[PDB]
Design a protein around this ligand. Structure first.
Ligand SMILES: *Cc1cc2c(cc1C)nc1c(=O)[nH]c(=O)nc-1n2C[C@H](O)[C@H](O)[C@H](O)COP(=O)(O)OP(=O)(O)OC[C@H]1O[C@@H](n2cnc3c(N)ncnc32)[C@H](O)[C@@H]1O
Ligand SMILES: *Cc1cc2c(cc1C)nc1c(=O)[nH]c(=O)nc-1n2C[C@H](O)[C@H](O)[C@H](O)COP(=O)(O)OP(=O)(O)OC[C@H]1O[C@@H](n2cnc3c(N)ncnc32)[C@H](O)[C@@H]1O
Ligand SMILES: NCc1ccc([N+](=O)[O-])cc1
Ligand SMILES: NCc1ccc([N+](=O)[O-])cc1
Lengths: 494, 499
């Protein structure tokens, strides 16, 4: 029944908010729709895999909040294998390489690739992390898809194919589905292209020993009986002195304040009294999540390492079910595995198959790309299609179709009376990630502390000390990278 | 508690489904979220206006199902005033005209305008009404916005400006928001550009005497206590023998079958057990409704008619709050009024103002467009912002952003076990309209009758006899319209003789 704050949603963001409020001495209740916490993180345990992250998994330098929270909970990280060579597979052939970016030899193609990445970052510098709709060319960029941008920018099919894969991998959506403004903001707020795509020194550097699901589980342990599982919220009534929150099983909860820590569009599952203001009412019908199947194929050994391949594959083309893989082998060197993402329209297309059929397709792809018959002899398989999840809507995160961010973006984290908005979608740094989940949860919790007169306005947004365990190397460019001309620039010079 | 079919939603589609089922001898219940039926139709009555439609209103030739349903309920139509001249207001000046299309004098601009409309219809012919995703270039067209299509097609700012206004008016959304495939389908399934934009001989030809909301009200009267108001559905459980439907006030309903007659995205407000299949799960988060404020300004007399203006204004330009108006005077000639739409981004922008501030802006616009100081002397004002409606989501209808119709379109009316899908969005002829609501409601009811073994598969989709009261003139083109070149075609012809 009665408490200080009801938190709707027990993913990382809701759990982080609840923990903060609880630690401050308030009485909190977390209402969670599922029979588990973790949300878009989910760690499966069985004897075959020991543990595997079927949802959110990777953390890296500059993600200091998730690192701090996890460390406090007694968790440790290990490094994703990137010792040996990466592979770029293009037009049916594998090209091994080192460093974050797949190399390019054709000079014209080199100029075009260089200019594409550079231009993404140039554009991003004009986009405020906390208010992308304030970009000088906000409307122009918002009224275009990433597909139109790429069509204008890329003078080679090669650069355009890699740019397209980059978009599909980053936001699990097609270039024609997403706003140019939103995508450029998305990249910028993760620290730029190099940081977002990198394993070593970027977002995919590390995983948690034992799985990321332990973050939400261990907070649930701390909160004890304050977490209510299988309590989908159906109704929020703000017409009276105390906020009334009702669940599907008819339980009633009364609080001074509410934190909505669910994906924005999942706000649609709640009936509001009084109705939401017009802008939020429409916003929450305009913001879908992307489409992905996360697939993990297990092998007797990490055989790719013997051929001086780390297990990272960047795989061009329509025929490939999976466009990106990483080595998912345990730090001990056992439970050898390849993690792959089936992205965007392929998730939709390949979902029609059976589990066994998808396994076979992945193994045949990997055998080709790795040039290894050993890829054809899997010992186990796990996968999760996030498109089927009623209480997620997709993965990894919410994307903004053209026109939406400029028109509706400002209401995303705008409080509605006594409802404050957490969830990774509301973060300003690594929004879309576990890191942004923590930022948003703790910020929403502190907005409530301030509303209660407990802290100054000054302390709502709080900086994070850099992790000593995962230090960040700065992102550098070369003189030639900075100053080499684009394709049209070379033509203007001619 | 127990019945044959629960219908979720008491708008025209749900009411049409419920009526058909009831007439066939089944026990039906309608569960309606609001304290009223009608949904996206709403007829306000007070002494100042007598009655006024604040939501859906116009019907016209080829909309035979809504016409038949309304006639059977004892309703009559009247013709929207189009006796005098229409006005096209462009770059601060008004140009009166007759006929559906605003005329163009510059022969280059003339070629461009002609080619634009022609091309919309050309492309539409390639799109099946019942399966737009089967169009030969479906993916190509779906992966483009209407803005990109317009940028490629229109060689003049003049054609591009009018085309933009046409999209905004038709689907209450910006050109950059909507799929080109979806918009081309949407126009084609209303019978094409001429039919959709026309008053005389098109969609805006007529209104119902007394308001469109009488359609839903009169069906409610027929069904009696079977319509439950203020019963928003929160939960549908299909795990057992009978389907279980729960409302917000905790009432339980058990049925053999369910019809969902709500806007597709509003399916999100229901928790499903078992969960929806993956495609529908994601589809319902991908399909927003448009943005509109419908505004009616009342005057002492229909003074525009004295100046040989019928009251239709097509008003281009960012500064104009309202891009389209029609005369909304009663057929008796009293309660003189102008209806105008505030569309898409302007609905969002101008919603920040007060009602009094919006009235002032509209009057000042109308005075300018009509060249009439009388427009500054309104006697009354009514308006409705459909963006604020929890149980509509917007108006007039659902639009599809780029990429969505080809990926998700096929599940829109695909049954989910014992749930069948009605609502205007699922129609194949005049989807988006009251007409499409009737088609979809009755088709969904018959899908259930067929499932029950009561009718053959053959009878699920049923043709409609043409109205005798509202006959449809065919859509014609001229020889020149058909064969005049586009701008680039003229240029190709020039480059050819220069060799
Ligand atoms: C799915 C996924 C995500 C992911 C990714 C790969 C996949 C396949 N890889 C990631 C990675 O490597 N590194 C990273 O940092 N992030 C990665 N992502 C995304 C990441 O998992 C998410 O950003 C993060 O988990 C989001 O957290 P948040 O707390 O903001 O949101 P959530 O996990 O969805 O939690 C919401 C909870 O709310 C419950 N819910 C939903 N509706 C209700 C109602 N009505 N009532 C009560 N509770 C509700 C959900 O069940 C959920 O638990
Ligand atoms: C808003 C609008 C619409 C409109 C238009 C102008 C405006 C401003 N002009 C039109 C016109 O001139 N001619 C025409 O034919 N159509 C026009 N439109 C669109 C038209 O009104 C709609 O196409 C039509 O009314 C749609 O009917 P349909 O039956 O398909 O859908 P609905 O009216 O939205 O009814 C849905 C009902 O469901 C209830 N609801 C919603 N959620 C729930 C839940 N969870 N549980 C129970 N009931 C629910 C809604 O309250 C509604 O009554
Ligand atoms: N959520 C996992 C993930 C996200 C982004 C990239 N990337 O390369 O941009 C790789 C992997
Ligand atoms: N829903 C009203 C309406 C719809 C479409 C048009 N049009 O011109 O295409 C006019 C008015």
């Amino acid at each position: 029944n009665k408490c200080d704050v009801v938190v709707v949603g027990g993913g990382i963001s809701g759990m982080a908010a609840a923990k903060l409020l609880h630690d401050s001495g308030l009485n909190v209740v977390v209402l969670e729709a599922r029979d588990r916490v973790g949300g878009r993180t989910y760690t499966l345990r069985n004897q075959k895999v020991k543990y595997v992250d079927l949802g959110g998994s990777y953390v890296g330098p500059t993600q200091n909040r998730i690192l701090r929270l996890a460390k406090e909970l007694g968790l440790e990280t290990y490094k994703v294998n990137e010792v040996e060579r990466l592979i770029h597979h293009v037009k049916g052939k594998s090209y091994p390489f080192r460093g974050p970016f797949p190399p390019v030899w054709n000079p014209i193609t080199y100029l075009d690739h260089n200019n594409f990445w550079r231009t993404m970052d140039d554009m991003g510098r004009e986009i405020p992390s906390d208010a992308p709709w304030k970009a000088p060319l906000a409307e122009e960029w918002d009224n275009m898809t990433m597909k139109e941008l790429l069509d204008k920018l890329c003078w080679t099919e090669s650069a355009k194919q890699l740019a397209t894969l980059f978009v599909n991998l980053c936001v699990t959506a097609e270039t024609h589905e997403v706003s140019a403004l939103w995508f450029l903001w998305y990249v910028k707020q993760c620290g730029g292209t190099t940081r977002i795509i990198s394993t070593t020194n970027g977002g995919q550097e590390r995983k948690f020993v034992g799985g990321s699901g332990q973050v939400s589980e261990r907070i649930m342990d701390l909160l004890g009986d304050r977490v209510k599982l299988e309590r989908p919220v159906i109704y929020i009534d703000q017409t009276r002195e105390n906020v009334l929150v009702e669940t599907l099983n008819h339980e009633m909860y009364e609080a001074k304040y509410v934190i909505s820590a669910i994906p924005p569009t999942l706000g649609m599952k709640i009936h509001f009294n009084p109705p939401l203001p017009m802008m939020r009412n429409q916003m929450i019908t305009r913001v879908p999540l992307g489409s992905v199947i996360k697939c993990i194929v297990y092998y007797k050994e990490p055989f790719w390492r013997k051929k001086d391949y780390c297990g990272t594959m960047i795989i061009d083309g329509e025929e490939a079910p999976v466009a990106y893989t990483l080595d998912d082998t345990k730090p001990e060197g056992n439970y050898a595995a390849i993690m792959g993402f089936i992205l965007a329209h392929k998730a939709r297309k390949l979902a029609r198959l059976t589990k066994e059929e998808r396994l076979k397709k992945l193994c045949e792809l990997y055998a080709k790309v790795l040039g290894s018959l050993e890829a054809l002899e899997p010992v186990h398989y796990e996968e999760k299609n996030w498109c089927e999840e009623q209480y997620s809507g997709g993965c990894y995160t919410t994307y903004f179709p053209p026109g939406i961010l400029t028109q509706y973006g400002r209401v995303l984290r705008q409080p509605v009376d006594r409802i404050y908005f957490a969830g990774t979608e509301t973060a300003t740094h690594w929004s879309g990630y576990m890191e942004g989940a923590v930022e948003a949860g703790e910020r929403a919790a502190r907005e409530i502390l301030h509303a209660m007169g407990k802290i100054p306005e000054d302390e709502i947004w709080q900086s994070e000390p850099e992790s000593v365990d995962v230090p960040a190397q700065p992102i550098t460019t070369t003189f030639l990278e900075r100053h080499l001309p684009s394709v049209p620039g070379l033509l203007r010079l001619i």
